[PDB]
RNA sequence: GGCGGUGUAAGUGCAGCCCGUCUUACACCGUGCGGCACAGAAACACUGAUGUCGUAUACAGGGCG
């Protein structure tokens, strides 16, 4: 019944500005506290900001005070986080969250948005090159090389191949660009009958590639 | 600013174990403490509210307790779907503060990696760089060591590794290692070897290829 | 309720007696303010009850055997 859909993430340079949105349904945001919570990659949860019902009182983490503004539009049932003067350390997945109803779940945050990624960096967007990892049960894969920023998505055979797939976390190269591999293991006999195509999408650069992986 | 000191920062437990996670508040937070469970790449999910009340739909094997400023999350018997990172949170005073997290992984029998090696593609060799890739598939425990040799010469500083999260269906890990070389260096040398040390192997295993096989 | 005002009575600075002041009781009249609990879709603010525990001028001495 309750949904929270976030948008507005992406890449900006240091000192830049973004506005995140959290569009709610199933409840009126006016009668709940709404919070923003962020998570830097590989790190823990960090509370960012909140707005109270009835008063409209707002509260901020020390690191963001003066730079971020949380707000709510009652007519659109949408909450917002205006982020100005962004820094590298603000890079994180940002979540909106509903603080629940007092008599039902105390002060626990019972519903969460899906998260939106914010990257603060001077490096330029670049789409990846995709190279096959030719079949060696057999292992095969794709190398997704030299892209910025995160993330890429990889599927196999347009989602029909999921078992045995391992898409590894990206590593940052010394060049400042990311690289990952996605592998899958299959029965060797299937190499003769099933075509294996890795589907790579790099939405931040609008690069989308399908690479057939064949025996060498 | 109220601190929430959470311990331990990680733990590995077997299916069926009772696990206890502790969060200490730097000062009184009354009972305004919540606990969350977070799976990789997902939003956190509320488990416990007001220190000790179970949120609707959460299994009875989860419970919370308060003694003064010490708060405890208990899983009475650990199930395989309980691997995650767990967080405490205080909502007594602004700014709100989360504990640092307890990553819970599932114990499992030792399993040696299955090792595969991939030469660079002809397409990449048109470009001036060569990437050689070594895959270590479905091993446990997580710790593993990869050394690269080019014509028996040990490589250093020209490789990077990345590890998956623990698999939900067999509780293993996989690891990929990528060796970066110039196109010219790759086309000159013949024998490319990945050497893997892991507790499931009594001595290191080598997988290799010869350029042009 | 607590506090204050006024009135009536009794007791009360002495070796003793008297007046006052002081205290207590009763009567009527004015009159609150906090802190902490609770609820309202509710951490603050806002609205509404009811409890509790607390609070507020440090002006008294004189007369006669």
Conformation bin of residue B199: beta by default, left when phi > 0, alpha when psi is -120 to 50: alpha
Q: Which CATH architecture has domain A3-120?
A: Sandwich (2.60)
Closest Cβ opposite residue B98 in set A45, A99, A145: A45
Burial A102-136 (b: 16+ CB within 10 A, else e): eeebbbbbbbbbebbbbbbeeeeebbbbbbbbbbb
Task: Report how this structure was experimentally obtained.
Answer: X-ray
- Domain coordinates of chain A in residue numbers? 3-120, 129-213
B1 contact to strand C (CB, 7 A limit): no
**Calpha distance B198→B144 (Å, rounded):** 5
Cα torsion B88, B93, B97, B102 to 10°: value is: -20
Resolution in A: 2.1
**Residues with Cβ within 8 Å of residue A208, at least 6 apart in sequence:** A199, A200, A201, A202
Domain A3-120 shares a fold with domain A129-213: yes
User: Are A163 and A183 within 8 A, CB to CB?
Assistant: no
Options 2.60.15.10, 1.10.10.10, 3.40.50.2300, 2.60.40.10; CATH for A129-213 is 2.60.40.10
CB-proximal positions of chain C, under 7 Å = 39-46
* Cα-to-chain-centroid distance, residue A91: 11
Tell me whether residues B36 and A45 touch, CB distance under 8 A: yes
Distance in Å from C55's C1' to A106's CA comes to 35
A74 contact to strand C (CB, 7 A limit): no
A26 contact to strand C (CB, 7 A limit): no
Please identify among residues 63-92 of chain A the ones whose CB lies closer than 8 Å to any CB of chain B. none
Domains of chain B (ranges, CATH numbers): 4-106 (2.60.40.10), 114-210 (2.60.40.10)
**Calpha distance B68→B167 (Å, rounded):** 38
Sort strands A10-12 and A116-120 into parallel, antiparallel or unpaired.
parallel
Q: Is B126 helix (H, G, I), strand (E, B) or coil?
A: coil
DSSP chain A: --EEEEE--EEE-TT--EEEEEEEESS-GGGS-EEEEEE-TTS-EEEEEEE-TTT--EEE-TTTTTTEEEEEETTTTEEEEEE-S--GGG-EEEEEEEE--HHHHTT-EEEE---EEEEE-SSPPBPPEEEEE----EEEEEEEEEEBSS--EEEEGGGTB-TTEEEPPPEE-TTS-EEEEEEEEE-GGGGGT--EEEEEEEGGGTEEEEEEE---
Residues of B in contact with A180 (CB under 8 A): 162
Q: Is A146's Cβ below 8 Å from some Cβ in B?
A: no
Q: Which residue of A has its CA nearest to B123?
A: A131
**Calpha distance B186→B119 (Å, rounded):** 10
Nucleotide nearest to A104 (CA to C1'): C41
CA A154 to each of CA A93, A168, B176: distance values in angstroms, whole numbers, following the listed order: 20, 10, 16
Q: Hey, how many other C-beta atoms are within 10 angstroms of the C-beta on A3? A: 12
**Calpha distance B135→B115 (Å, rounded):** 6
């Amino acid at each position: 019944e309750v949904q929270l859909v976030e948008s507005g993430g992406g890449l900006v340079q240091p000192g830049g500005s973004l506005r995140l949105s959290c569009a709610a349904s199933g409840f009126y945001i006016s009668y709940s506290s709404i919070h923003w919570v962020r998570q830097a990659p590989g790190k823990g949860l960090e509370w960012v900001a909140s707005i109270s019902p009835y008063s409209g009182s707002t509260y901020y983490a020390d690191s963001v005070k003066g730079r971020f503004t949380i707000s709510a539009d009652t007519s659109k049932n949408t909450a917002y986080l205006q982020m100005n003067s962004l820094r590298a350390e603000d890079t994180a997945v940002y979540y909106c969250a509903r603080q629940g109803y007092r008599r039902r779940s105390g002060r626990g945050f019972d519903y969460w948005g899906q998260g939106t990624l914010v990257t603060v960096s001077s490096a330029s967007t670049k789409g990846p090159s995709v190279f096959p990892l030719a079949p060696s049960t057999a292992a095969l894969g794709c190398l997704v090389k030299d892209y910025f920023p995160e993330p890429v998505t990889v599927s196999w055979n347009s989602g029909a191949l999921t078992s045995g797939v391992h898409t590894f976390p990206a590593v940052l190269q010394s060049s400042g660009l990311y690289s990952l591999s996605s592998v899958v293991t299959v029965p060797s006999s299937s190499l003769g009958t099933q075509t294996y195509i890795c589907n790579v999408n790099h939405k931040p650069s609008n690069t989308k590639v399908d690479k057939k992986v064949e025996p060498k | 600013d109220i601190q929430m000191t959470q311990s331990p920062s990680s733990l590995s437990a077997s299916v069926g174990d009772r696990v206890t996670i502790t969060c200490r508040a730097s000062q009184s937070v009354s009972s305004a403490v919540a606990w969350y469970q977070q799976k990789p790449g997902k939003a956190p999910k509320l488990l416990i509210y007001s220190a000790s009340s179970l949120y609707s739909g959460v299994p009875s094997r989860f419970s919370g307790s308060r003694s003064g400023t010490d708060f405890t999350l208990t899983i009475s018997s650990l199930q395989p779907e309980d691997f995650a990172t767990y967080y405490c949170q205080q909502s007594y005073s602004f700014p709100n503060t989360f504990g640092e997290g307890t990553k819970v992984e599932i114990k499992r029998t030792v399993a040696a990696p299955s090792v595969f090696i991939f030469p660079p593609s002809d397409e990449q060799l048109k470009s001036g760089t060569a990437s050689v890739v070594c895959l270590l598939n479905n091993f446990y425990p997580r710790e593993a060591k990869v050394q690269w040799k080019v014509d028996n010469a040990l490589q250093s500083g020209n490789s990077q590794e990345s590890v998956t999260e623990q698999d939900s269906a067999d509780s293993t890990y996989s690891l990929s290692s990528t060796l970066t070389l110039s196109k010219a260096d790759y086309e000159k040398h013949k024998v490319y070897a990945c050497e893997v040390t892991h507790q499931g192997l009594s001595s290191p295993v080598t997988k290799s290829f010869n350029r042009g096989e």
